[PDB]
């Protein structure tokens, strides 16, 4: 598995494989997860575990968004959706939904062995990356965060390729050439490569074929 | 974690005597877990012209057991100037069997024959030597479905009345019928078995064709 | 067991073997996999036996309650979470390889479920001792929108397959074609002594009694 | 597997079922469990049949051998020790062996019981094999030295059939020897134990035997 | 190696408008000693309904008793007799409630599902009520394969009485004499619509 | 060797009219680090014989230098084409070491294929060997190739096709349902090429860069390896 | 270790059991007590195993029958004695097992005189004869040779005596004393054997 | 659980043990005679342990005395013998141990009357009084107590009457038959005690 | 541990860290350990088992260089060493010594865990790296080879960087930031960094203090 998020100067994309499982029982998964319209989440791990957490925080998260709402009235194929909650009233923060995320994990961290990356953006600190990592320890990325098996083949890469207030174009080429690396490393890592950018008012999902040339 | 050096290969070997002749079949199929490696290969091996051996268990094994007592053999008739009769070869078989006690052969043999005076002749033996003569007897992943049968059919212990009367031909088809049913019972037993006739004559190889799956 | 499922266009098919073994043993020779949650949603089981068989009767009888209180269609997605939060209540056992495919609103879906309580929606999967049997055939042949009657000679070929290839696998073929308005469950869709004489038993005693 | 042999007034009684099972299998019930070492001296089989099988044929060897060397009949006494020394030097390696060796030499009548353990003890009554205390519970209740050569055979006959009433593991058929000054005989080479226990213990046959 | 302590096996075989079951009758202890030779392992729930119970002789007591509790409830709530088939799912549902801590049992079910026709029903199952119902025959036991390898080659489809009698008895016997922890006696049910003949079997007793 | 380390993937055999056609991708892995992938796992042993391997690479690259200097020797007393060892041999040579090797339990952690052309009677090329520098095909029956398996149990066989590795599921499910006699040599790459593309979507180890080698009249031509098409 | 012993006749059963307290290597007693437990109403226990666990399982089986006994006024049935008594072992099976062993004889007129096996496991059976602990293996078969049907007490004593002779003999625990239960024409006798 | 006694005075030693021949739960004989070992020249081995490690080493050490004492045509010292027995028990200690326990008694014109004691691991030393086996730990404080220099070989045959009734009493093998060796006036003697 | 080796054009440049051991026991080691004037070897895994089969391996490197002789006549801080053998007449081959390693481990690959790469120039092959892997397997590296725990964290970062036919100045480069990227992500290689760079002639040997800067 390989998942990515890096913050560019107008949004944070996230971006992950879709190999699963020597034998590939699936080669078309869905690593990143809609919790909320401006809030998606990438997972590495167990399956079941993490995908019995992302139910868990969708409950929570769909809990407090329905609690956030005050009384009265107030003002290479992509996917585009725009957000319902233009002005973020009732959408819940990143972090509260990456923390309650931490608490739990970390509650059953006995058992649990699951590494999330929580990418969204909320109007308080705008875009964000949280990592929580296998014990439950989150840590806010504000330059970009990796986890997986294959992430690690891409690490200096990447520290190489980052910069600062990226665009969303050589963001967006970055984020792919870091999967497609990885895919081409990690035997665990493979299939079609799936990227989720995520702004202030939007948030649009890529699907891409990918193949690795190089003459070195 | 250390490496295991035995697996079972599969299938069955069923050996029957008559007054003058016996019968032994053996199923082709070889295996490895879930899966067949190949549809065909066989499990017996001739000795002399009176005398074969079919076996179950590690097929690395049965083979090289089957080479070596074949090369014994004709190092006796070499040597001493005769075929070795089905007792010979016996008693050679279990020397040899024993020889390796304490890492023994990962296979289950049956020894049939004709011997001298024209009696057909049936010898079982288990990884370590330990052997006996039978009028019948069973080998291998099927040999716990199809020993009963044999038992009822050949003793008929459990029956007052008895028709303790067979011929050749009838051996042949009750043979088939067990191979058959064990193909039905056994997952490892299948595909094809060869039946081998020692008589008076000599020894005559015959086909059947068994469920795939 | 080989178990397969594939999604043609409105309609899923969902295939099945018909052995069952006691170890190295044949323990029924025409058993049924192939087993129904509701009129819209079917489901094949691969893992422990009893644990299969008593999941499939506790999903079809809550779907049931389900569509009685509700009064709607059942959705596949709603079998999907029953069974992959009622697996994951225990840590890995009571395990079941599922493969649940129907159609709803939503459209013709298939699911493979996991013992540990991780479903995917798939467009065709296998599961089973002769699943990759089944997925060789499927990999090769299997394209998006098919007919019916190709997607049944697809499962046939792919069931085969794990007859053939399997040793855990064998019998006869049995498929369901599911569709929104009703299902078809064709069992058997393919198929690839003495008597003895009155008195020979020795008894020691025998008592009658009347009903 | 039940051995057995007693010292009497006519010589030596040996006597053994005839089962050989692979665990919970019964492989066979047609094994002789009784071994002529020499014209002279029987030996008996229990535990590993291959162990016991070859090395008491080897101790034929050596005792053919010896006899050749020095135109003289081997004595009971000097086979088991040298049977005992040759199980005592593969002490820790498996072997499985249980054998009563009893004969008749110019010292007269002897019996040995001797196992793997290099174990060797000189007696007049032995039994050995998962049955072997049941046929002692018999012979020590019964064993009288004055028997008459139809009392100790029909003794025997009968502590074998109580230790395969009692036993899973002993079975088939009783054999009976009786060895005397000049060599051998059977007196029973095979009787088949169903007709003992419709002889002694249900011999009107009217229903099942109450244990 | 549980199932090894006692031993026993039972088995069950249909003809036309008649069912059989059968078991051995040893009660063993230690794999080895024989402690009873009457211990029957076939227990009648109601005329139509007998289940054979094989395994540890105390899980086969406690299921039975559990099975007679339940069966009397249903049939004095109901006033009626049980139906195989619902006694069958029953059994299932019971089984399966102990997963985790299991009876170590393998029983089978034998009756008549009524319709009055009579069909015979015949049922097997594992230890947590997994069960695969059958036209020919049923086993479970030590000596399954045995059982297998018999009917397999020996059963007749839609013999009358006297033939499943014979067919079933040859089949147990035979099993049985391969078999070092079961045997000690046989009995043999044979069930038709007006009446039941229960035999007892001069068998080996090694 | 006490388990595998660097890995090689399956090995795919086929008989076809002119004689025997040989695939395996060129990947090693390093657990699920695929770390190398310009590697060669078919072995030419002699121009009638090529080896193939699956499972460890330091155990395959032993037993190659074993046929290596078992085919020298052969050459060194060599007087007549005949002498040359057949791949028959090989294959029982093989199937020896593995049985001694798993006797003493220090098994190679590999699936052999030894594959090749047992019959002289269609070429001259065994009349002149040239080991340090390398007309149409001649139509070969299927009884004088040979393909052979041996295991690390020693388990040995041989058939008109033979795979190892995970090409036993996916790529013998369609050898067996589609390999038919006297196929051309390009009916038999498109199988080949099937098989090895259901590999690719399947087994995580495995690569789209295959290598193909012949065994034919005309010797053991190694093809230039190539990218899966489509 | 604890070697007990049961014969069942149409018109008596007998109980035997050695009189040994074992603590690790030394004999605490030559008259143990702790194995014999009598019931109110023509019913006996005979427990092996663990003394404690002997203890506990004999007397909870007593203070349980007898208040069934006293509570409902009646005598209980051998039978019902004898499944109470399994089902009661079997219950603490899956929860802190009792160790014990157990021959259970009573005598009814539903059901005349009655012997019941039944093993640590709580696998029962009624027998004719039975036997438990080591000391079994010497003895049963004697059961099984000289019993018959139409035993008289004092034939039964003898072939008890034949037993206990042969515990002496041939079994690795010289076991020399021994208590014996006989119940028979409505009388329930106490007898020590010694040799 | 073979026990082995010896007692050494100023003008005589008494070794003693039970007569029993074990395997698993039967006793094969109640006459054993595996552990005692007479050597020639007023010399015995009384060996513990298993069966065939006895007759093993005690065959073994008495074939190697009498090579000895042939070969040089002298009555080896006791001293001579317990120690070159100690050095071959522990010479095998640590390749294949023989699992045996001794007493070496003897006599000598040059140390008079003497006892050692011997353990499986090879820790020896010279005793007035010891004793193996479990029944050690009944009979060793009896040894003690009623233990005097100036004992007569009857007052020591008195006290192994002791021994023996307080092993039939509290040991957990009721052992019943003991064999004797009495070393004393230049003669051996062999003694058969029951009870 | 990370040991890199890169072939450009005309010659073969080696490189590795110095930090040996959660506690550093020395921080000033010599992984790169000169087996012939024109034959490097870089070690990764156990030390002992390593150096040992360094010592070995010279040993037999000597032998075959004694043997290999003919009877006749014929024809930032570095430090550089021409070769004796200026034509290449009795140095030993690389492939040779190269091989020699991997049978002396893959018959004792039971116990030895080492991970090799042999670097060097003869006139044969010319430049040559050759990679030994643990259980005694050779593979001839045309481009690049890396080892150690480092290595993996710069896998994708060398694969973008790598070109067919560099420089001196851009592979000298290269190795060096490869080797610090290694050690500003691995706890487990720190230290100055020492590159051994071999050519048709002669033999450089750098040694280079480091630090990382970004602004990622
Ligand atoms: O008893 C069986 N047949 C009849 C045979 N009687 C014997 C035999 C009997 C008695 C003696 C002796 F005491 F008188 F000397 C010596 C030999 C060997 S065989 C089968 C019963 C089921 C198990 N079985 C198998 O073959 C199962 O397959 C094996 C193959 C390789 C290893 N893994 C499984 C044997």
């Given at each position: 598995?390989?998942?990515?998020?890096?913050?560019?100067?107008?949004?944070?994309?996230?971006?992950?494989?879709?190999?699963?499982?020597?034998?590939?029982?699936?080669?078309?998964?869905?690593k990143?997860?809609?919790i909320?319209?401006?809030?998606?989440?990438?997972?590495?791990?167990?399956?079941?575990?993490?995908?019995?957490?992302?139910?868990?925080?969708?409950?929570?998260?769909?809990?407090?968004?329905?609690?956030?709402?005050?009384?009265?009235?107030?003002?290479?194929?992509?996917?585009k959706?725009?957000?319902?909650?233009?002005?973020?009233?009732?959408?819940?923060?990143?972090?509260?939904?990456?923390?309650?995320?931490?608490?739990?994990?970390?509650?059953?961290?006995?058992?649990?062995?699951?590494?999330?990356?929580?990418?969204?953006?909320?109007?308080?600190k705008?875009?964000?990356?949280?990592?929580?990592?296998?014990?439950?320890?989150?840590?806010?990325?504000?330059?970009?965060?990796?986890?997986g098996?294959?992430?690690?083949?891409?690490?200096?890469?990447?520290?190489?390729?980052?910069?600062?207030?990226?665009?969303?174009?050589?963001?967006?080429?970055?984020?792919?050439?870091?999967?497609?690396?990885?895919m081409?490393?990690?035997?665990?890592?493979?299939?079609?490569?799936?990227?989720?950018?995520?702004?202030?008012?939007?948030?649009?999902?890529?699907?891409?074929?990918?193949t690795?040339?190089?003459?070195? | 974690?250390?490496?295991y050096?035995?697996?079972?290969?599969?299938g069955?070997?069923?050996?029957?005597?008559?007054?003058?002749?016996?019968?032994?079949?053996?199923?082709?199929?070889?295996?490895?877990?879930?899966?067949?490696?190949?549809?065909?290969?066989?499990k017996?091996?001739?000795?002399?012209?009176?005398?074969?051996?079919?076996?179950?268990?590690?097929?690395?094994?049965?083979?090289?057991?089957?080479?070596?007592?074949?090369?014994?053999?004709?190092?006796?008739?070499?040597?001493?100037?005769?075929?070795?009769?089905?007792?010979?070869?016996?008693?050679?078989?279990?020397?040899?069997?024993?020889?390796?006690?304490?890492?023994?052969?990962?296979?289950?043999?049956?020894?049939?024959?004709?011997?001298?005076?024209?009696?057909?002749?049936?010898?079982?033996?288990?990884?370590?030597?330990?052997?006996?003569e039978?009028?019948?007897?069973?080998?291998?992943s099927?040999?716990?479905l199809?020993?009963?049968?044999?038992?009822?059919?050949v003793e008929?212990?459990?029956?007052?009345?008895?028709?303790?009367?067979?011929?050749?031909?009838?051996?042949?088809?009750?043979?088939?019928?067990?191979?058959?049913?064990?193909?039905?019972?056994?997952?490892?037993?299948?595909?094809?078995?060869?039946?081998?006739?020692?008589?008076?004559?000599?020894?005559?190889?015959?086909?059947?064709?068994?469920?795939?799956? | 067991?080989?178990?397969?499922?594939?999604?043609?266009?409105?309609?899923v098919?969902?295939?099945?073997?018909?052995?069952?073994?006691?170890?190295?043993?044949?323990?029924?020779?025409?058993?049924?996999?192939?087993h129904?949650?509701?009129?819209?949603?079917?489901?094949?089981?691969?893992?422990?036996?009893?644990?299969?068989?008593?999941?499939?009767?506790?999903?079809?009888?809550?779907?049931?309650?389900?569509?009685?209180?509700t009064?709607?269609?059942?959705?596949?997605?709603?079998?999907?979470?029953?069974?992959?939060?009622?697996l994951?209540?225990?840590?890995?056992?009571k395990?079941?390889?599922?493969?649940?495919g129907?159609?709803?609103?939503?459209?013709?879906?298939?699911?493979?479920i996991?013992?540990?309580?991780?479903?995917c929606?798939?467009?065709?999967?296998?599961?089973?001792?002769?699943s990759?049997?089944?997925?060789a055939?499927?990999?090769?042949?299997?394209?998006?929108?098919?007919?019916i009657?190709?997607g049944?000679?697809l499962?046939?070929?792919?069931?085969?397959?794990?007859?053939?290839?399997?040793?855990?696998?064998?019998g006869?073929?049995?498929?369901?074609?599911?569709?929104?308005?009703?299902?078809?469950?064709?069992?058997?869709?393919?198929?690839?002594?003495?008597?003895?004489?009155?008195?020979?038993?020795?008894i020691?005693?025998?008592?009658?009694?009347?009903? | 597997?039940?051995?057995?042999?007693?010292?009497?007034?006519?010589?030596?009684?040996v006597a053994?079922?005839?089962?050989?099972?692979?665990?919970?299998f019964?492989?066979?019930q047609?094994?002789?469990?009784?071994?002529?070492?020499?014209?002279?001296?029987?030996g008996?089989?229990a535990?590993?049949?291959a162990?016991?099988?070859?090395?008491?044929?080897?101790?034929?060897?050596?005792?053919?051998?010896?006899?050749?060397?020095?135109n003289?009949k081997?004595?009971?006494?000097?086979?088991?020790?040298?049977?005992?020394?040759?199980?005592?030097?593969?002490?820790?390696?498996?072997?499985?062996?249980?054998?009563?060796?009893?004969?008749?030499?110019?010292?007269?009548?002897?019996?040995?019981?001797?196992?793997?353990?290099?174990?060797?003890?000189?007696?007049?009554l032995?039994?050995?094999?998962?049955?072997?205390?049941?046929?002692?519970?018999?012979?020590?209740?019964?064993?009288?030295?004055?028997?008459?050569?139809?009392?100790?055979?029909?003794?025997?006959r009968?502590?074998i059939?109580?230790?395969t009433?009692?036993?899973?593991?002993?079975?088939?058929?009783?054999?009976?020897?009786?060895?005397?000054?000049?060599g051998?005989?059977?007196?029973?080479?095979?009787?088949?134990?169903?007709?003992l226990?419709?002889?002694?213990?249900?011999?009107e046959?009217?229903?099942?035997?109450?244990? | 190696?549980?199932?090894?302590?006692?031993?026993?096996?039972?088995?069950?075989?249909?003809?036309?408008?008649?069912?059989?079951?059968?078991?051995?009758?040893?009660?063993?202890?230690?794999?080895?000693?024989?402690?009873?030779?009457?211990?029957?392992?076939?227990?009648?729930?109601?005329?139509?309904?007998?289940?054979?119970?094989?395994?540890?002789?105390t899980?086969?007591?406690?299921?039975?008793?559990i099975?007679?509790?339940?069966?009397?409830?249903?049939?004095?709530?109901?006033?009626?007799?049980?139906?195989?088939?619902?006694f069958?799912?029953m059994?299932?549902?019971?089984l399966?409630?102990?997963?985790?801590?299991?009876?170590?049992?393998?029983?089978?079910?034998?009756?008549?599902?009524?319709?009055?026709?009579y069909?015979?029903?015949?049922?097997?199952?594992?230890?947590?009520?997994?069960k695969?119902?059958t036209?020919?025959?049923?086993?479970?036991?030590?000596?399954?394969?045995?059982?297998?390898g018999?009917?397999?080659?020996?059963?007749?489809?839609?013999?009358?009485?006297?033939?499943?009698?014979?067919?079933?008895s040859?089949?147990?016997?035979s099993?049985?004499?391969?078999?070092?922890?079961?045997?000690?006696?046989?009995?043999?049910?044979?069930?038709?619509?007006?009446?039941?003949?229960?035999?007892?079997?001069?068998?080996?007793?090694? | 060797?006490?388990?595998?380390?660097?890995?090689?993937?399956?090995?795919?055999?086929?008989?076809?009219?002119?004689?025997?056609?040989?695939?395996?991708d060129?990947?090693?892995?390093?657990?699920?680090?695929?770390?190398?992938?310009?590697?060669?796992?078919?072995?030419k042993?002699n121009?009638?014989?090529?080896?193939?391997?699956?499972?460890?690479?330091?155990?395959?690259?032993?037993?190659?230098?074993?046929?290596?200097?078992?085919?020298?020797?052969?050459?060194?007393?060599?007087?007549?084409?005949?002498?040359?060892?057949?791949?028959?041999?090989?294959?029982?040579?093989?199937?020896?070491?593995?049985?001694?090797?798993?006797?003493?339990?220090?098994?190679?952690?590999?699936?052999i294929?030894?594959?090749?052309?047992?019959?002289?009677?269609?070429?001259?090329?065994?009349?002149?060997?040239?080991?340090?520098?390398?007309?149409?095909?001649?139509?070969?029956?299927?009884?004088?190739?040979?393909?052979?398996?041996?295991?690390?149990?020693?388990?040995?066989?041989?058939?008109?096709?033979?795979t190892?590795?995970?090409?036993?599921?996916?790529?013998?499910?369609?050898?067996?349902?589609?390999?038919?006699?006297?196929?051309?040599?390009?009916?038999?790459r498109?199988?080949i090429?099937?098989?090895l593309?259901?590999?690719?979507?399947?087994?995580?180890?495995?690569?789209?860069?295959?290598?193909?080698?012949?065994?034919?009249?005309?010797?053991?031509?190694?093809?230039?390896?190539?990218?899966?098409?489509? | 270790?604890?070697?007990?012993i049961?014969?069942?006749?149409?018109?008596?059963?007998?109980?035997?059991?050695?009189?040994?307290?074992?603590?690790?290597?030394?004999?605490?007693?030559?008259?143990?007590?702790?194995?014999?437990?009598?019931?109110?109403?023509?019913?006996?226990?005979?427990?092996?195993?663990?003394?404690?666990?002997?203890?506990?399982?004999?007397?909870?089986?007593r203070?349980?029958?007898?208040?069934?006994?006293?509570?409902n006024?009646?005598?209980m049935?051998?039978?019902?004695?004898?499944?109470?008594?399994?089902?009661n072992l079997?219950?603490?099976?899956?929860?802190?097992?009792?160790?014990?062993?157990?021959?259970i004889?009573?005598?009814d007129?539903?059901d005349?005189?009655?012997?019941?096996?039944?093993?640590?496991?709580?696998?029962?059976?009624?027998?004719?004869?039975?036997?438990?602990?080591?000391?079994?293996?010497?003895?049963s078969?004697?059961?099984?040779?000289?019993?018959?049907?139409?035993?008289?007490?004092?034939?039964?004593?003898?072939?008890?005596?034949?037993?206990?002779?042969?515990?002496?003999?041939?079994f690795?625990?010289?076991?020399?004393?021994?208590?014996?239960?006989?119940?028979?024409?409505?009388?329930?006798?106490?007898?020590?054997?010694?040799?």
């Amino acid at each position: 598995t390989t998942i990515i998020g890096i913050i560019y100067d107008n949004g944070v994309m996230l971006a992950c494989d879709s190999r699963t499982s020597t034998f590939i029982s699936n080669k078309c998964s869905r690593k990143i997860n809609r919790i909320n319209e401006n809030l998606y989440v990438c997972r590495s791990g167990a399956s079941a575990h993490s995908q019995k957490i992302i139910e868990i925080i969708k409950h929570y998260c769909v809990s407090m968004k329905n609690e956030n709402r005050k009384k009265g009235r107030f003002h290479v194929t992509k996917n585009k959706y725009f957000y319902e909650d233009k002005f973020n009233d009732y959408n819940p923060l990143v972090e509260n939904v990456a923390h309650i995320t931490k608490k739990i994990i970390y509650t059953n961290n006995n058992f649990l062995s699951c590494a999330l990356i929580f990418g969204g953006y909320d109007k308080i600190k705008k875009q964000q990356l949280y990592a929580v990592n296998l014990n439950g320890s989150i840590i806010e990325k504000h330059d970009f965060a990796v986890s997986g098996s294959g992430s690690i083949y891409i690490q200096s890469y990447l520290q190489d390729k980052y910069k600062k207030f990226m665009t969303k174009k050589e963001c967006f080429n970055l984020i792919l050439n870091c999967v497609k690396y990885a895919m081409h490393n990690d035997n665990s890592s493979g299939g079609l490569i799936r990227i989720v950018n995520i702004t202030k008012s939007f948030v649009e999902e890529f699907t891409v074929v990918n193949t690795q040339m190089n003459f070195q | 974690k250390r490496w295991y050096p035995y697996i079972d290969n599969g299938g069955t070997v069923i050996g029957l005597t008559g007054k003058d002749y016996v019968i032994l079949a053996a199923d082709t199929r070889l295996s490895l877990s879930y899966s067949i490696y190949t549809r065909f290969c066989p499990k017996i091996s001739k000795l002399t012209d009176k005398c074969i051996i079919g076996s179950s268990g590690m097929q690395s094994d049965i083979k090289t057991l089957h080479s070596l007592l074949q090369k014994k053999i004709q190092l006796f008739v070499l040597e001493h100037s005769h075929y070795p009769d089905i007792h010979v070869i016996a008693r050679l078989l279990c020397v040899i069997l024993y020889s390796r006690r304490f890492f023994p052969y990962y296979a289950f043999n049956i020894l049939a024959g004709v011997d001298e005076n024209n009696k057909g002749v049936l010898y079982n033996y288990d990884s370590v030597g330990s052997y006996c003569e039978a009028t019948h007897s069973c080998v291998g992943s099927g040999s716990q479905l199809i020993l009963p049968i044999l038992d009822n059919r050949v003793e008929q212990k459990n029956q007052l009345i008895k028709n303790t009367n067979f011929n050749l031909g009838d051996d042949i088809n009750f043979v088939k019928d067990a191979i058959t049913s064990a193909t039905e019972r056994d997952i490892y037993t299948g595909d094809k078995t060869l039946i081998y006739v020692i008589d008076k004559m000599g020894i005559n190889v015959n086909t059947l064709d068994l469920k795939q799956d | 067991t080989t178990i397969c499922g594939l999604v043609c266009q409105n309609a899923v098919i969902l295939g099945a073997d018909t052995r069952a073994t006691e170890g190295p043993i044949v323990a029924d020779k025409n058993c049924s996999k192939l087993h129904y949650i509701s009129k819209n949603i079917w489901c094949a089981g691969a893992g422990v036996a009893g644990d299969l068989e008593h999941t499939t009767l506790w999903l079809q009888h809550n779907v049931e309650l389900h569509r009685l209180n509700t009064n709607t269609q059942p959705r596949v997605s709603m079998c999907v979470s029953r069974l992959t939060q009622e697996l994951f209540k225990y840590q890995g056992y009571k395990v079941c390889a599922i493969v649940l495919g129907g159609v709803d609103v939503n459209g013709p879906q298939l699911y493979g479920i996991h013992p540990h309580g991780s479903s995917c929606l798939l467009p065709f999967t296998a599961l089973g001792s002769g699943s990759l049997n089944a997925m060789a055939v499927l990999e090769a042949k299997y394209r998006d929108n098919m007919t019916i009657e190709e997607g049944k000679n697809l499962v046939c070929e792919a069931i085969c397959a794990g007859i053939f290839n399997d040793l855990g696998s064998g019998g006869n073929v049995d498929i369901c074609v599911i569709t929104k308005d009703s299902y078809q469950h064709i069992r058997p869709y393919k198929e690839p002594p003495t008597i003895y004489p009155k008195g020979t038993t020795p008894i020691l005693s025998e008592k009658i009694e009347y009903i | 597997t039940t051995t057995l042999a007693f010292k009497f007034k006519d010589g030596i009684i040996v006597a053994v079922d005839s089962r050989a099972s692979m665990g919970s299998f019964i492989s066979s019930q047609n094994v002789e469990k009784i071994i002529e070492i020499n014209k002279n001296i029987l030996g008996t089989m229990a535990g590993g049949a291959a162990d016991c099988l070859y090395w008491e044929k080897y101790l034929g060897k050596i005792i053919k051998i010896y006899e050749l060397r020095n135109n003289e009949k081997i004595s009971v006494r000097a086979a088991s020790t040298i049977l005992s020394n040759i199980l005592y030097q593969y002490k820790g390696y498996g072997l499985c062996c249980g054998i009563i060796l009893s004969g008749y030499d110019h010292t007269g009548f002897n019996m040995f019981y001797v196992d793997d353990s290099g174990k060797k003890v000189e007696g007049n009554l032995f039994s050995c094999g998962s049955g072997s205390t049941y046929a002692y519970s018999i012979l020590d209740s019964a064993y009288d030295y004055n028997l008459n050569l139809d009392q100790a055979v029909e003794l025997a006959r009968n502590a074998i059939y109580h230790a395969t009433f009692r036993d899973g593991g002993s079975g088939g058929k009783v054999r009976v020897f009786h060895i005397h000054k000049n060599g051998y005989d059977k007196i029973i080479e095979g009787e088949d134990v169903f007709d003992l226990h419709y002889h002694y213990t249900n011999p009107e046959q009217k229903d099942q035997y109450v244990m | 190696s549980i199932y090894n302590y006692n031993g026993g096996c039972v088995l069950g075989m249909s003809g036309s408008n008649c069912v059989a079951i059968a078991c051995d009758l040893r009660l063993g202890a230690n794999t080895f000693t024989t402690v009873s030779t009457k211990f029957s392992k076939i227990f009648k729930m109601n005329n139509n309904v007998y289940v054979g119970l094989s395994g540890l002789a105390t899980d086969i007591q406690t299921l039975y008793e559990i099975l007679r509790y339940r069966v009397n409830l249903y049939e004095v709530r109901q006033d009626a007799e049980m139906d195989v088939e619902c006694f069958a799912n029953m059994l299932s549902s019971i089984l399966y409630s102990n997963r985790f801590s299991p009876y170590f049992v393998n029983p089978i079910v034998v009756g008549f599902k009524l319709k009055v026709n009579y069909e015979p029903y015949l049922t097997a199952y594992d230890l947590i009520g997994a069960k695969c119902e059958t036209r020919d025959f049923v086993v479970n036991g030590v000596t399954s394969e045995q059982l297998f390898g018999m009917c397999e080659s020996l059963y007749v489809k839609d013999q009358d009485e006297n033939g499943l009698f014979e067919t079933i008895s040859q089949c147990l016997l035979s099993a049985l004499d391969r078999d070092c922890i079961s045997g000690w006696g046989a009995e043999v049910l044979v069930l038709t619509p007006e009446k039941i003949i229960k035999k007892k079997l001069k068998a080996r007793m090694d | 060797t006490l388990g595998p380390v660097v890995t090689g993937t399956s090995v795919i055999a086929i008989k076809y009219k002119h004689g025997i056609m040989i695939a395996a991708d060129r990947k090693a892995s390093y657990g699920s680090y695929a770390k190398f992938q310009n590697v060669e796992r078919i072995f030419k042993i002699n121009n009638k014989t090529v080896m193939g391997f699956s499972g460890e690479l330091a155990d395959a690259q032993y037993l190659h230098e074993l046929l290596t200097r078992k085919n020298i020797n052969n050459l060194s007393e060599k007087k007549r084409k005949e002498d040359m060892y057949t791949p028959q041999h090989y294959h029982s040579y093989v199937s020896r070491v593995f049985y001694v090797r798993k006797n003493r339990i220090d098994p190679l952690f590999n699936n052999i294929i030894i594959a090749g052309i047992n019959s002289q009677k269609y070429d001259n090329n065994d009349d002149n060997v040239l080991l340090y520098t390398n007309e149409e095909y001649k139509e070969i029956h299927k009884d004088d190739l040979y393909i052979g398996f041996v295991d690390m149990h020693g388990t040995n066989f041989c058939d008109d096709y033979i795979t190892t590795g995970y090409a036993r599921y996916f790529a013998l499910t369609l050898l067996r349902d589609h390999y038919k006699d006297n196929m051309t040599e390009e009916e038999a790459r498109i199988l080949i090429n099937e098989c090895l593309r259901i590999l690719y979507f399947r087994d995580a180890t495995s690569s789209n860069f295959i290598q193909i080698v012949k065994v034919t009249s005309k010797g053991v031509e190694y093809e230039e390896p190539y990218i899966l098409p489509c | 270790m604890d070697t007990l012993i049961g014969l069942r006749g149409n018109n008596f059963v007998v109980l035997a059991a050695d009189t040994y307290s074992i603590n690790s290597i030394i004999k605490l007693k030559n008259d143990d007590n702790t194995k014999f437990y009598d019931i109110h109403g023509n019913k006996c226990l005979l427990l092996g195993g663990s003394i404690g666990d002997r203890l506990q399982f004999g007397e909870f089986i007593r203070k349980n029958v007898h208040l069934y006994q006293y509570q409902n006024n009646t005598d209980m049935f051998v039978k019902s004695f004898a499944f109470f008594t399994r089902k009661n072992l079997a219950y603490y099976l899956r929860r802190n097992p009792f160790e014990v062993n157990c021959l259970i004889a009573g005598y009814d007129k539903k059901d005349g005189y009655q012997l019941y096996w039944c093993d640590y496991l709580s696998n029962m059976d009624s027998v004719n004869k039975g036997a438990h602990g080591y000391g079994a293996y010497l003895v049963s078969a004697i059961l099984d040779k000289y019993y018959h049907e139409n035993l008289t007490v004092d034939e039964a004593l003898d072939i008890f005596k034949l037993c206990f002779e042969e515990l002496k003999k041939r079994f690795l625990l010289t076991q020399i004393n021994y208590e014996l239960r006989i119940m028979y024409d409505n009388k329930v006798e106490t007898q020590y054997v010694t040799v």
